[PDB]
Symmetry: C2
Subunit: 67 residues, 2 copies
């Protein structure tokens, strides 16, 4: 379909708000591509995805070697 | 809404259209700046999809991988 996604692995929860939504760092596949680092808000059951950013392994490593 | 990039911290990549994916400190609606990762047009007058992280959220993350 116009886009598909899958949380392959959960790495870290950064926070949660009053409504149960969580901000998370996961490994997520989009449109059947190899999973990538993904930072974004998720609903309690993870069926709605909020604003966020997807990072390639190279970028993510850059960020971590950066800071 | 209003917004200002108060500090440019890092560029993660750029595309053929000249747009960049960056980590900045960005103020929204007059609020204290927060960490912000998203795609910016070349002149930074248009942004793409991204997220904003509180100071405690960004620090939570950096600790976990290093």
């Amino acid at each position: 379909a116009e886009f598909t996604f899958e949380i392959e692995e959960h790495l870290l929860t950064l926070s949660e708000n009053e409504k149960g939504w969580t901000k998370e760092i996961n490994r997520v596949s989009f449109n059947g591509a190899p999973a990538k680092f993904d930072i974004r808000a998720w609903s309690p059951d993870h069926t709605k995805m909020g604003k966020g950013i997807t990072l390639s392994n190279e970028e993510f490593q850059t960020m971590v070697d950066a800071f």
